[PDB]
């Protein structure tokens, strides 16, 4: 198994660049609106402690340079929604895919299309950590790059890139401008909360192992969900939600291993370790594959 | 620092479905030619030992059903180049990018666009192993998926997918239809030569780790090129040439770490193990980033 991104073409056709003064970043052109991080309106000095409502009043439509390639799109309106700017343009993007804006939960994976000056550069899979950071690869100029999943040609946009933490992980918003995690779009050193292991994804990994005949860790025990969650937290694992239990349903049906039976197997792994053995060839338990990712790659 | 694929949009617009009888796979549509694996002409019985020229002479243009999305393309002629079939169609692909066919060297990387029934499914980075396999993710119906690099809007196609070895690694051809490695397009269980580790890539990856702020594996020792190669060959690593040393020049200049100093670090990692520590999140030495991959991503 390996990290597989979605084909990026439907998103590539939506990337533009947005410039205010000398500040340039990326934007997302869907129908006749361009979405981008609101800090494009900031001068490099104003980012240190910005007042976005006051900064935005000083701006007019003609202050915004939106370019598809080197072709300018005329801006006819502007508004701010949380930390994203919405620029109405006079052309509906003919490459707009079927799309949705969704806000994901920790553990969910998505593809990131890293972009610079409106030009796509590369694509890779990320997982939203429980501390609401992602382990990306982003340089200067990457803000406004988006993350997405594609289901039956419908693109669900879930991430817009804003910041690199001092630890080198990355933080951002959904496409309604609401940050994931406790971060703010100011030029300031911010720290995420201590991270945890994504339990639902580790369980997905164990199901993947079972699907492939690697099942030594299956045990004779079961557990209640509450009992499991209390043990999980003492090993820095996330507690399971009812939604986690339900997204494991398909894999549980496919293998015949009840979710709570797999929880009891993981619990034993947590208290006694792998004892020198491997699962799917690895000595480490992987927590960046969702149940959907496993089904995607196994079936 | 992440395994990063090229944006796949320019290739997505070229993927089609090719069907001959009950056999279907993917094809690559460029200008007015569709390229696909020639075993699409084989029935299940033919595939055990196909005499391809004999089988192709018996097919007509209308035996080939080519579908692009929903629209059917009419085949107006066909020729065979080694293991690749070239179907001339009566419509030019309007989305054909600037492109080239290239045969890549062992150790080089490329992006794979995995496709099923002519529809792109996922994108990820692969390296051509020294034993001329690739460690990919391909399921039933993935034949004809292609591997590629992109440089300033020009797509260099280097791989077309044909088979999965019993070990789970993958084998295929260049776009001239010549296999990488000693493999043959027949339905038999085929073994590869013993694989070795791409030494220059491991070194590039260690430099990537240093550029990203990890230095724990460095040491105060040096080695000569030949003494390093002696230990490298002992551990089934490929020899490091003076060309490799020169290619690593920029990464050494960026970090101020002499190439042979980093060879001494790798020598220690090989002789001492990693001791449960990790480099860029990996518990194993990674050899599928080239020096260019590191430079392109880190800057
Ligand atoms: C954008 O592209 C801005 O348009 C940029 C993306 C990062 C640059 C390097 N890698 C990236 O991911 N984002 C920023 O520069 C943001 C801008 C804010 C949200 C207005 N700032 C940071 O990410 C940032 C600031 C500071 C900092 O200060 C002082 C100290 C430490 C870390 C840090 N990150
Ligand atoms: C294609 O898609 C065929 O159109 C298919 C791709 C593989 C299927 C599973 N994963 C893949 O990557 N390729 C094949 O099925 C090829 C067909 C050849 C080129 C005619 N065959 C194999 O990959 C193959 C055959 C055998 C085998 O026999 C007997 C025994 C063991 C392994 C094996 N692999």
Author numbering:
A (entry chain A), B (entry chain B): 3 to 301
Show the paper's wording:
The main protease (M pro) of coronaviruses plays a key role in viral replication, thus serving as a hot target for drug design. M pro is able to process polyproteins to produce several nonstructural proteins (NSPs) necessary for viral replication. The recognition site of coronaviral M pro depends on Gln at the P1 position, and no proteases in humans share a similar cleavage site. PF-00835231 is an inhibitor designed for the main protease of SARS-CoV that emerged in 2003, but its clinical trials were suspended due to the rapid disappearance of the SARS outbreak.
